[PDB]
PDB file of C-alpha atoms in Angstrom:
ATOM      1  CA  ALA Q   1     -78.692  16.957 112.106  1.00 37.53           C
ATOM      2  CA  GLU Q   2     -80.824  14.264 110.501  1.00 35.40           C
ATOM      3  CA  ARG Q   3     -81.924  12.930 113.821  1.00 32.88           C
ATOM      4  CA  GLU Q   4     -82.597  16.528 114.946  1.00 32.76           C
ATOM      5  CA  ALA Q   5     -84.798  17.307 111.973  1.00 32.06           C
ATOM      6  CA  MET Q   6     -86.603  14.013 112.218  1.00 30.12           C
ATOM      7  CA  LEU Q   7     -87.437  14.910 115.819  1.00 32.65           C
ATOM      8  CA  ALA Q   8     -88.606  18.284 114.595  1.00 31.54           C
ATOM      9  CA  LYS Q   9     -90.906  16.843 112.015  1.00 33.15           C
ATOM     10  CA  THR Q  10     -92.393  14.207 114.370  1.00 33.23           C
ATOM     11  CA  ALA Q  11     -93.154  17.226 116.538  1.00 30.94           C
ATOM     12  CA  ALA Q  12     -94.675  19.461 113.956  1.00 34.17           C
ATOM     13  CA  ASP Q  13     -96.700  16.987 112.096  1.00 35.92           C
ATOM     14  CA  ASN Q  14     -98.347  15.690 115.181  1.00 35.70           C
ATOM     15  CA  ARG Q  15     -99.062  19.241 116.164  1.00 35.89           C
ATOM     16  CA  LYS Q  16     -99.939  20.545 112.797  1.00 35.64           C
ATOM     17  CA  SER Q  17    -102.168  17.537 112.082  1.00 31.23           C
ATOM     18  CA  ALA Q  18    -103.987  17.948 115.321  1.00 31.86           C
ATOM     19  CA  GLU Q  19    -104.384  21.692 114.894  1.00 31.97           C
ATOM     20  CA  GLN Q  20    -105.403  21.267 111.219  1.00 32.31           C
ATOM     21  CA  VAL Q  21    -108.082  18.686 112.024  1.00 32.42           C
ATOM     22  CA  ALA Q  22    -109.388  21.032 114.751  1.00 29.49           C
ATOM     23  CA  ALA Q  23    -109.239  23.907 112.304  1.00 32.95           C
ATOM     24  CA  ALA Q  24    -111.035  21.967 109.617  1.00 35.01           C
ATOM     25  CA  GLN Q  25    -113.849  21.003 111.967  1.00 34.38           C
ATOM     26  CA  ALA Q  26    -114.050  24.614 113.243  1.00 31.57           C
ATOM     27  CA  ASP Q  27    -114.051  26.119 109.752  1.00 30.81           C
ATOM     28  CA  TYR Q  28    -116.694  23.663 108.454  1.00 32.70           C
ATOM     29  CA  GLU Q  29    -118.889  24.567 111.524  1.00 29.12           C
ATOM     30  CA  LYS Q  30    -118.203  28.307 110.970  1.00 27.51           C
ATOM     31  CA  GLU Q  31    -119.032  28.226 107.278  1.00 27.49           C
ATOM     32  CA  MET Q  32    -122.179  26.107 107.865  1.00 26.40           C
ATOM     33  CA  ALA Q  33    -123.416  28.500 110.583  1.00 24.38           C
ATOM     34  CA  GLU Q  34    -122.594  31.476 108.286  1.00 19.19           C
ATOM     35  CA  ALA Q  35    -124.768  29.826 105.691  1.00 19.67           C
ATOM     36  CA  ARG Q  36    -127.504  29.322 108.268  1.00 19.92           C
ATOM     37  CA  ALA Q  37    -127.230  32.948 109.439  1.00 22.27           C
ATOM     38  CA  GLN Q  38    -127.369  34.232 105.825  1.00 24.11           C
ATOM     39  CA  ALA Q  39    -130.541  31.953 105.220  1.00 24.70           C
ATOM     40  CA  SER Q  40    -132.080  33.334 108.383  1.00 25.16           C
ATOM     41  CA  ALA Q  41    -131.362  36.913 107.325  1.00 22.42           C
ATOM     42  CA  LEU Q  42    -132.799  36.213 103.843  1.00 21.74           C
ATOM     43  CA  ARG Q  43    -135.959  34.704 105.441  1.00 19.35           C
ATOM     44  CA  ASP Q  44    -136.365  37.680 107.806  1.00 20.84           C
ATOM     45  CA  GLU Q  45    -135.864  40.078 104.804  1.00 22.23           C
ATOM     46  CA  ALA Q  46    -138.686  38.159 103.053  1.00 20.94           C
ATOM     47  CA  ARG Q  47    -140.825  38.458 106.195  1.00 23.08           C
ATOM     48  CA  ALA Q  48    -140.125  42.190 106.324  1.00 23.61           C
ATOM     49  CA  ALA Q  49    -140.924  42.568 102.586  1.00 26.42           C
ATOM     50  CA  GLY Q  50    -144.172  40.662 103.126  1.00 23.72           C
ATOM     51  CA  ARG Q  51    -145.163  42.852 106.086  1.00 21.62           C
ATOM     52  CA  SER Q  52    -144.324  45.967 103.995  1.00 17.67           C
ATOM     53  CA  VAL Q  53    -146.350  44.823 101.055  1.00 19.43           C
ATOM     54  CA  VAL Q  54    -149.323  43.768 103.159  1.00 21.00           C
ATOM     55  CA  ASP Q  55    -149.208  47.124 105.006  1.00 19.75           C
ATOM     56  CA  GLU Q  56    -148.896  49.173 101.815  1.00 16.98           C
ATOM     57  CA  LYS Q  57    -151.659  47.283  99.965  1.00 16.65           C
TER      58      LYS Q  57
ATOM     59  CA  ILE R   1     -37.807  -9.829 131.159  1.00 17.59           C
ATOM     60  CA  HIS R   2     -35.963  -8.090 128.331  1.00 16.49           C
ATOM     61  CA  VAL R   3     -37.711  -4.679 128.364  1.00 17.88           C
ATOM     62  CA  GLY R   4     -37.271  -2.578 125.298  1.00 20.87           C
ATOM     63  CA  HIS R   5     -35.485  -3.962 122.253  1.00 21.49           C
ATOM     64  CA  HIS R   6     -37.937  -2.698 119.653  1.00 19.98           C
ATOM     65  CA  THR R   7     -37.864  -5.035 116.621  1.00 21.70           C
ATOM     66  CA  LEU R   8     -37.823  -3.949 112.951  1.00 26.21           C
ATOM     67  CA  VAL R   9     -35.690  -0.999 113.967  1.00 26.56           C
ATOM     68  CA  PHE R  10     -34.238   0.840 111.001  1.00 29.10           C
ATOM     69  CA  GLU R  11     -32.473   4.130 110.224  1.00 31.64           C
ATOM     70  CA  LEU R  12     -33.584   6.868 107.782  1.00 33.87           C
ATOM     71  CA  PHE R  13     -32.894  10.615 107.351  1.00 31.10           C
ATOM     72  CA  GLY R  14     -30.023  10.152 109.855  1.00 33.66           C
ATOM     73  CA  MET R  15     -32.288   9.123 112.697  1.00 37.32           C
ATOM     74  CA  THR R  16     -33.485   5.755 114.102  1.00 37.55           C
ATOM     75  CA  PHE R  17     -37.078   4.462 113.903  1.00 36.80           C
ATOM     76  CA  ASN R  18     -38.590   1.667 115.909  1.00 36.54           C
ATOM     77  CA  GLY R  19     -40.167  -0.395 113.089  1.00 37.63           C
ATOM     78  CA  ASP R  20     -42.482  -2.509 115.286  1.00 37.83           C
ATOM     79  CA  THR R  21     -44.049   0.665 116.903  1.00 38.89           C
ATOM     80  CA  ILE R  22     -44.532   2.232 113.485  1.00 42.08           C
ATOM     81  CA  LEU R  23     -46.159  -1.020 112.268  1.00 41.12           C
ATOM     82  CA  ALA R  24     -48.503  -1.163 115.272  1.00 41.52           C
ATOM     83  CA  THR R  25     -49.399   2.568 114.739  1.00 38.10           C
ATOM     84  CA  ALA R  26     -50.075   1.854 111.086  1.00 40.87           C
ATOM     85  CA  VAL R  27     -52.269  -1.132 111.940  1.00 41.69           C
ATOM     86  CA  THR R  28     -54.272   1.008 114.431  1.00 39.81           C
ATOM     87  CA  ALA R  29     -54.557   3.799 111.765  1.00 37.26           C
ATOM     88  CA  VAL R  30     -55.850   1.406 109.087  1.00 37.56           C
ATOM     89  CA  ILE R  31     -58.381  -0.038 111.522  1.00 35.91           C
ATOM     90  CA  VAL R  32     -59.582   3.497 112.371  1.00 36.38           C
ATOM     91  CA  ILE R  33     -59.613   4.382 108.695  1.00 33.58           C
ATOM     92  CA  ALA R  34     -61.616   1.294 107.830  1.00 33.58           C
ATOM     93  CA  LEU R  35     -64.158   2.208 110.521  1.00 31.93           C
ATOM     94  CA  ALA R  36     -64.335   5.786 109.232  1.00 34.72           C
ATOM     95  CA  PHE R  37     -64.818   4.666 105.685  1.00 35.59           C
ATOM     96  CA  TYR R  38     -67.450   2.053 106.533  1.00 37.56           C
ATOM     97  CA  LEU R  39     -69.272   4.807 108.452  1.00 36.04           C
ATOM     98  CA  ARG R  40     -68.974   7.225 105.409  1.00 35.62           C
ATOM     99  CA  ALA R  41     -70.356   4.596 103.052  1.00 36.10           C
ATOM    100  CA  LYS R  42     -73.129   3.649 105.436  1.00 34.58           C
ATOM    101  CA  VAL R  43     -73.936   6.968 107.211  1.00 35.14           C
ATOM    102  CA  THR R  44     -77.717   7.476 107.185  1.00 35.83           C
ATOM    103  CA  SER R  45     -79.571  10.401 108.610  1.00 34.68           C
ATOM    104  CA  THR R  46     -83.017   8.852 107.885  1.00 32.68           C
ATOM    105  CA  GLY R  47     -82.295   5.112 108.026  1.00 31.39           C
ATOM    106  CA  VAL R  48     -81.506   2.944 110.990  1.00 30.61           C
ATOM    107  CA  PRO R  49     -77.922   3.466 111.932  1.00 28.12           C
ATOM    108  CA  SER R  50     -75.362   0.631 111.552  1.00 26.69           C
ATOM    109  CA  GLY R  51     -73.090  -0.552 114.344  1.00 29.54           C
ATOM    110  CA  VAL R  52     -70.188   1.724 113.320  1.00 29.71           C
ATOM    111  CA  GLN R  53     -72.628   4.588 113.055  1.00 31.13           C
ATOM    112  CA  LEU R  54     -73.901   4.025 116.560  1.00 29.21           C
ATOM    113  CA  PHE R  55     -70.274   3.788 117.915  1.00 27.70           C
ATOM    114  CA  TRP R  56     -69.188   6.964 116.125  1.00 26.78           C
ATOM    115  CA  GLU R  57     -72.366   8.783 117.181  1.00 28.54           C
ATOM    116  CA  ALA R  58     -71.931   7.814 120.828  1.00 25.88           C
ATOM    117  CA  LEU R  59     -68.260   8.891 120.846  1.00 27.14           C
ATOM    118  CA  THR R  60     -68.986  12.159 119.116  1.00 28.32           C
ATOM    119  CA  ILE R  61     -71.900  12.905 121.330  1.00 26.86           C
ATOM    120  CA  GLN R  62     -69.758  12.231 124.447  1.00 24.14           C
ATOM    121  CA  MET R  63     -66.931  14.474 123.266  1.00 25.64           C
ATOM    122  CA  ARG R  64     -69.388  17.181 122.174  1.00 25.26           C
ATOM    123  CA  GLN R  65     -71.050  17.176 125.574  1.00 23.46           C
ATOM    124  CA  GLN R  66     -67.705  17.495 127.157  1.00 27.77           C
ATOM    125  CA  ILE R  67     -66.831  20.385 125.087  1.00 28.60           C
ATOM    126  CA  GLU R  68     -70.216  22.080 125.658  1.00 31.38           C
ATOM    127  CA  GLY R  69     -69.821  21.559 129.481  1.00 31.96           C
ATOM    128  CA  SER R  70     -66.173  22.809 129.422  1.00 30.75           C
ATOM    129  CA  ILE R  71     -65.735  25.318 126.576  1.00 26.91           C
ATOM    130  CA  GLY R  72     -68.413  26.325 124.135  1.00 27.82           C
ATOM    131  CA  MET R  73     -68.587  24.412 120.868  1.00 28.08           C
ATOM    132  CA  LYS R  74     -68.598  27.713 119.050  1.00 26.08           C
ATOM    133  CA  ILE R  75     -65.263  28.530 120.578  1.00 26.07           C
ATOM    134  CA  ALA R  76     -63.826  24.977 120.100  1.00 26.26           C
ATOM    135  CA  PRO R  77     -65.168  23.269 116.991  1.00 21.89           C
ATOM    136  CA  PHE R  78     -61.776  21.968 116.167  1.00 23.04           C
ATOM    137  CA  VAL R  79     -61.316  20.048 119.388  1.00 23.00           C
ATOM    138  CA  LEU R  80     -64.148  17.548 118.808  1.00 22.59           C
ATOM    139  CA  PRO R  81     -62.369  15.898 115.843  1.00 23.73           C
ATOM    140  CA  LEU R  82     -59.171  15.868 117.999  1.00 23.70           C
ATOM    141  CA  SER R  83     -60.918  14.252 120.909  1.00 22.73           C
ATOM    142  CA  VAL R  84     -62.673  11.661 118.754  1.00 18.49           C
ATOM    143  CA  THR R  85     -59.507  10.730 116.790  1.00 20.64           C
ATOM    144  CA  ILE R  86     -57.478  10.564 120.031  1.00 21.37           C
ATOM    145  CA  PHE R  87     -60.052   8.344 121.768  1.00 22.29           C
ATOM    146  CA  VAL R  88     -60.441   5.910 118.871  1.00 20.78           C
ATOM    147  CA  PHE R  89     -56.640   5.767 118.149  1.00 18.62           C
ATOM    148  CA  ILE R  90     -55.707   4.959 121.797  1.00 15.03           C
ATOM    149  CA  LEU R  91     -58.686   2.596 122.242  1.00 14.81           C
ATOM    150  CA  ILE R  92     -57.856   0.611 119.124  1.00 14.76           C
ATOM    151  CA  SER R  93     -54.118   0.585 119.919  1.00 14.38           C
ATOM    152  CA  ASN R  94     -54.789  -0.788 123.431  1.00 14.06           C
ATOM    153  CA  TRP R  95     -57.483  -3.314 122.381  1.00 16.05           C
ATOM    154  CA  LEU R  96     -55.517  -4.746 119.480  1.00 13.12           C
ATOM    155  CA  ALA R  97     -53.082  -6.057 122.076  1.00 12.19           C
ATOM    156  CA  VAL R  98     -55.868  -8.361 123.384  1.00  8.22           C
ATOM    157  CA  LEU R  99     -55.488 -10.393 120.228  1.00  7.26           C
ATOM    158  CA  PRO R 100     -53.201 -13.536 120.716  1.00  7.94           C
ATOM    159  CA  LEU R 101     -50.356 -12.065 118.637  1.00  5.27           C
ATOM    160  CA  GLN R 102     -47.501 -13.316 120.946  1.00  3.67           C
ATOM    161  CA  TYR R 103     -45.321 -16.335 120.773  1.00  3.30           C
ATOM    162  CA  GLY R 104     -42.130 -17.912 122.230  1.00  8.73           C
ATOM    163  CA  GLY R 105     -38.735 -17.256 120.863  1.00  8.91           C
ATOM    164  CA  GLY R 106     -36.728 -18.781 124.058  1.00  6.78           C
ATOM    165  CA  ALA R 107     -37.886 -15.436 125.328  1.00  8.67           C
ATOM    166  CA  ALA R 108     -41.425 -14.265 124.608  1.00  9.04           C
ATOM    167  CA  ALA R 109     -41.916 -12.148 121.433  1.00  9.25           C
ATOM    168  CA  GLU R 110     -45.020 -10.318 120.462  1.00 11.46           C
ATOM    169  CA  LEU R 111     -46.160  -9.749 116.889  1.00 13.88           C
ATOM    170  CA  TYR R 112     -48.294  -6.740 117.881  1.00 11.95           C
ATOM    171  CA  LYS R 113     -47.131  -4.735 120.884  1.00  9.77           C
ATOM    172  CA  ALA R 114     -49.425  -1.910 121.854  1.00  7.61           C
ATOM    173  CA  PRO R 115     -47.824   1.298 120.346  1.00 10.14           C
ATOM    174  CA  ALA R 116     -48.517   3.188 123.614  1.00  8.40           C
ATOM    175  CA  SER R 117     -46.001   0.836 125.256  1.00  6.96           C
ATOM    176  CA  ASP R 118     -43.316   2.835 123.253  1.00  6.92           C
ATOM    177  CA  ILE R 119     -42.264   6.206 124.582  1.00  7.76           C
ATOM    178  CA  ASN R 120     -42.277   7.737 121.101  1.00  7.07           C
ATOM    179  CA  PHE R 121     -45.964   7.157 120.457  1.00  7.53           C
ATOM    180  CA  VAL R 122     -47.350   8.530 123.772  1.00  7.27           C
ATOM    181  CA  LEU R 123     -44.827  11.387 123.696  1.00  9.15           C
ATOM    182  CA  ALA R 124     -45.930  12.287 120.187  1.00 11.70           C
ATOM    183  CA  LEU R 125     -49.602  12.283 121.115  1.00 12.72           C
ATOM    184  CA  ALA R 126     -49.003  14.285 124.244  1.00 10.71           C
ATOM    185  CA  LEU R 127     -46.715  16.870 122.513  1.00 11.29           C
ATOM    186  CA  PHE R 128     -49.177  17.271 119.696  1.00 11.32           C
ATOM    187  CA  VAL R 129     -51.933  17.920 122.168  1.00 11.30           C
ATOM    188  CA  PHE R 130     -49.682  20.286 123.997  1.00 10.05           C
ATOM    189  CA  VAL R 131     -48.713  22.314 120.884  1.00  8.65           C
ATOM    190  CA  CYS R 132     -52.429  22.216 119.783  1.00 11.25           C
ATOM    191  CA  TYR R 133     -54.034  23.708 122.883  1.00  8.68           C
ATOM    192  CA  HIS R 134     -51.122  26.174 123.450  1.00  6.92           C
ATOM    193  CA  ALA R 135     -51.676  27.409 119.839  1.00  8.49           C
ATOM    194  CA  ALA R 136     -55.446  27.544 120.625  1.00  8.28           C
ATOM    195  CA  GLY R 137     -54.686  29.722 123.644  1.00  7.36           C
ATOM    196  CA  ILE R 138     -52.366  31.948 121.639  1.00 10.74           C
ATOM    197  CA  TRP R 139     -55.109  32.371 118.996  1.00 10.04           C
ATOM    198  CA  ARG R 140     -57.785  33.090 121.536  1.00  9.23           C
ATOM    199  CA  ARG R 141     -55.644  35.403 123.721  1.00  8.44           C
ATOM    200  CA  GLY R 142     -52.690  36.531 121.621  1.00  5.15           C
ATOM    201  CA  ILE R 143     -49.031  35.653 121.116  1.00  4.72           C
ATOM    202  CA  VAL R 144     -47.996  37.804 124.115  1.00  5.03           C
ATOM    203  CA  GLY R 145     -51.271  37.615 126.088  1.00  3.90           C
ATOM    204  CA  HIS R 146     -51.465  33.855 126.217  1.00  2.06           C
ATOM    205  CA  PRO R 147     -48.116  33.177 127.960  1.00  2.58           C
ATOM    206  CA  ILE R 148     -48.963  35.874 130.565  1.00  4.16           C
ATOM    207  CA  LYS R 149     -52.202  34.177 131.432  1.00  3.01           C
ATOM    208  CA  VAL R 150     -50.555  30.753 131.373  1.00  4.05           C
ATOM    209  CA  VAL R 151     -47.908  31.910 133.976  1.00  5.32           C
ATOM    210  CA  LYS R 152     -50.392  33.805 135.999  1.00  5.49           C
ATOM    211  CA  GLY R 153     -52.985  31.138 135.973  1.00  5.45           C
ATOM    212  CA  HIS R 154     -55.859  31.698 138.403  1.00  4.08           C
ATOM    213  CA  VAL R 155     -53.495  32.898 141.170  1.00  2.00           C
ATOM    214  CA  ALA R 156     -50.715  35.290 140.269  1.00  2.24           C
ATOM    215  CA  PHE R 157     -48.516  34.766 143.297  1.00  2.00           C
ATOM    216  CA  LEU R 158     -48.325  31.035 142.420  1.00  3.14           C
ATOM    217  CA  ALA R 159     -46.625  31.798 139.158  1.00  2.80           C
ATOM    218  CA  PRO R 160     -43.918  29.125 139.355  1.00  6.73           C
ATOM    219  CA  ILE R 161     -46.363  26.423 140.338  1.00  6.86           C
ATOM    220  CA  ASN R 162     -48.388  27.176 137.225  1.00 11.99           C
ATOM    221  CA  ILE R 163     -45.164  27.070 135.086  1.00 11.31           C
ATOM    222  CA  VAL R 164     -44.655  23.589 136.550  1.00 12.07           C
ATOM    223  CA  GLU R 165     -48.233  22.400 136.167  1.00 11.52           C
ATOM    224  CA  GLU R 166     -48.155  23.514 132.546  1.00  8.48           C
ATOM    225  CA  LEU R 167     -45.067  21.467 131.945  1.00 11.37           C
ATOM    226  CA  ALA R 168     -46.706  18.675 133.923  1.00 12.63           C
ATOM    227  CA  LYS R 169     -49.698  18.667 131.507  1.00 11.75           C
ATOM    228  CA  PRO R 170     -47.837  16.968 128.608  1.00 10.94           C
ATOM    229  CA  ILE R 171     -45.448  14.894 130.664  1.00 10.28           C
ATOM    230  CA  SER R 172     -48.163  13.284 132.794  1.00 11.69           C
ATOM    231  CA  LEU R 173     -50.503  13.037 129.867  1.00 15.22           C
ATOM    232  CA  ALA R 174     -47.836  11.126 128.081  1.00 12.64           C
ATOM    233  CA  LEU R 175     -46.424   9.013 130.957  1.00 13.54           C
ATOM    234  CA  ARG R 176     -49.851   8.255 132.426  1.00 11.45           C
ATOM    235  CA  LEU R 177     -50.583   6.670 129.062  1.00 12.21           C
ATOM    236  CA  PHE R 178     -47.050   5.124 128.840  1.00 14.90           C
ATOM    237  CA  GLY R 179     -46.794   3.355 132.080  1.00 15.02           C
ATOM    238  CA  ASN R 180     -50.288   1.995 131.896  1.00 16.60           C
ATOM    239  CA  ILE R 181     -49.690   0.292 128.587  1.00 18.25           C
ATOM    240  CA  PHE R 182     -45.941  -0.240 129.045  1.00 18.52           C
ATOM    241  CA  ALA R 183     -46.669  -2.009 132.336  1.00 17.93           C
ATOM    242  CA  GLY R 184     -49.059  -4.361 130.567  1.00 14.06           C
ATOM    243  CA  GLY R 185     -46.403  -5.311 128.062  1.00 15.67           C
ATOM    244  CA  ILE R 186     -44.328  -6.525 131.002  1.00 17.95           C
ATOM    245  CA  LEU R 187     -47.059  -8.437 132.750  1.00 17.31           C
ATOM    246  CA  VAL R 188     -47.986 -10.421 129.582  1.00 18.52           C
ATOM    247  CA  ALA R 189     -44.244 -11.099 129.280  1.00 19.25           C
ATOM    248  CA  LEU R 190     -44.035 -12.038 132.949  1.00 20.15           C
ATOM    249  CA  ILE R 191     -47.073 -14.280 132.664  1.00 21.69           C
ATOM    250  CA  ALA R 192     -45.313 -15.827 129.676  1.00 24.66           C
ATOM    251  CA  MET R 193     -42.754 -17.225 132.056  1.00 23.17           C
ATOM    252  CA  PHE R 194     -45.453 -19.603 133.418  1.00 22.35           C
ATOM    253  CA  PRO R 195     -46.015 -22.883 131.774  1.00 20.97           C
ATOM    254  CA  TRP R 196     -48.919 -23.105 129.284  1.00 20.18           C
ATOM    255  CA  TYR R 197     -51.146 -25.023 131.655  1.00 20.19           C
ATOM    256  CA  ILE R 198     -51.226 -22.224 134.177  1.00 20.58           C
ATOM    257  CA  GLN R 199     -50.259 -19.285 131.974  1.00 24.59           C
ATOM    258  CA  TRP R 200     -53.787 -18.875 130.530  1.00 23.87           C
ATOM    259  CA  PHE R 201     -55.394 -17.970 133.871  1.00 24.18           C
ATOM    260  CA  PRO R 202     -53.355 -14.896 134.926  1.00 27.11           C
ATOM    261  CA  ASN R 203     -53.074 -13.919 131.288  1.00 26.39           C
ATOM    262  CA  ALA R 204     -56.821 -14.302 130.761  1.00 28.78           C
ATOM    263  CA  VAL R 205     -57.761 -12.208 133.814  1.00 30.30           C
ATOM    264  CA  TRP R 206     -55.131  -9.534 133.113  1.00 32.27           C
ATOM    265  CA  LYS R 207     -56.155  -8.984 129.537  1.00 33.08           C
ATOM    266  CA  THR R 208     -59.916  -9.194 130.376  1.00 32.73           C
ATOM    267  CA  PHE R 209     -59.336  -6.294 132.788  1.00 31.80           C
ATOM    268  CA  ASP R 210     -56.892  -4.611 130.384  1.00 30.80           C
ATOM    269  CA  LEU R 211     -59.701  -4.173 127.954  1.00 33.11           C
ATOM    270  CA  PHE R 212     -61.475  -1.897 130.487  1.00 33.30           C
ATOM    271  CA  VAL R 213     -58.074  -0.329 131.525  1.00 32.09           C
ATOM    272  CA  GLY R 214     -57.380   0.656 127.929  1.00 33.67           C
ATOM    273  CA  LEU R 215     -60.939   1.939 127.453  1.00 38.57           C
ATOM    274  CA  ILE R 216     -60.550   4.070 130.598  1.00 38.01           C
ATOM    275  CA  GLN R 217     -57.056   5.242 129.507  1.00 38.55           C
ATOM    276  CA  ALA R 218     -58.326   6.421 126.092  1.00 37.06           C
ATOM    277  CA  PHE R 219     -61.316   8.098 127.712  1.00 39.72           C
ATOM    278  CA  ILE R 220     -59.121   9.839 130.290  1.00 36.37           C
ATOM    279  CA  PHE R 221     -56.550  10.983 127.707  1.00 36.96           C
ATOM    280  CA  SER R 222     -59.385  12.444 125.552  1.00 33.81           C
ATOM    281  CA  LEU R 223     -61.123  13.926 128.538  1.00 32.61           C
ATOM    282  CA  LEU R 224     -57.962  15.679 129.813  1.00 31.44           C
ATOM    283  CA  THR R 225     -57.157  16.939 126.263  1.00 32.48           C
ATOM    284  CA  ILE R 226     -60.671  18.544 126.202  1.00 28.83           C
ATOM    285  CA  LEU R 227     -60.095  19.898 129.751  1.00 27.90           C
ATOM    286  CA  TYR R 228     -56.699  21.377 128.861  1.00 24.51           C
ATOM    287  CA  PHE R 229     -58.127  23.031 125.817  1.00 24.56           C
ATOM    288  CA  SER R 230     -60.979  24.525 127.913  1.00 24.96           C
ATOM    289  CA  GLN R 231     -58.364  25.825 130.357  1.00 23.87           C
ATOM    290  CA  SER R 232     -56.020  27.256 127.733  1.00 24.80           C
ATOM    291  CA  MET R 233     -58.686  28.964 125.607  1.00 24.87           C
ATOM    292  CA  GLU R 234     -60.344  30.759 128.504  1.00 27.55           C
TER     293      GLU R 234
END
């Protein structure tokens, strides 16, 4: 049973380590791009507010 | 060649016992027990297995594979210990005869004669296996159902043949082991009639090949035990 579980762990770790490195890279990229998207939306909201204030004034 | 004449013979409980055969069986049992205990002390799931661990693992894996390929391990969990103990017992009994435990009287005497060379040892093993797998068949089929299947076998109109083959299962399984080792006990005795300067050659070759012969006999006895179990359980 010990040999069996050892095989099982060798299998999972390799897999889970690979998948978790991939997931860490993907999640860092996703969070960074979400931050960029929020920044772009904020800048566009500022542009819209500026256009609105110039038009109203 | 003076066949027979078991030494250390005694009498107890109103029946005779061959002392030498009992001593050889006890020696084999203590060797097997020492191997088992040394495994138990040094059995490692995570560490690197020892020599005895590798031996036991290989034997257990072989017998478990046989059971899987003949009758599911779920149905026959109790037959793996039987096969392993049978294999080790017979193997050690046969291989302990390779040691130079023989001398000259002026007939040749042998301190350790392989217990299988005695009819009692092989008959006891064969009858124990016989009772064991017949009880297994009774358990898996029923007290009345199992004999009916045993007599019928795979072909009903061959009912007597089955009834012979069944009785042939223990007998052969005993005598096949008997004659193979018994015969050896004679050859070593016969080769003892040679003078020392030419005795070593036939003795050397015979016992070198008897190592393999005893290994094969232990393997065959265990394999046929497993096969008979698979037959009698379903």
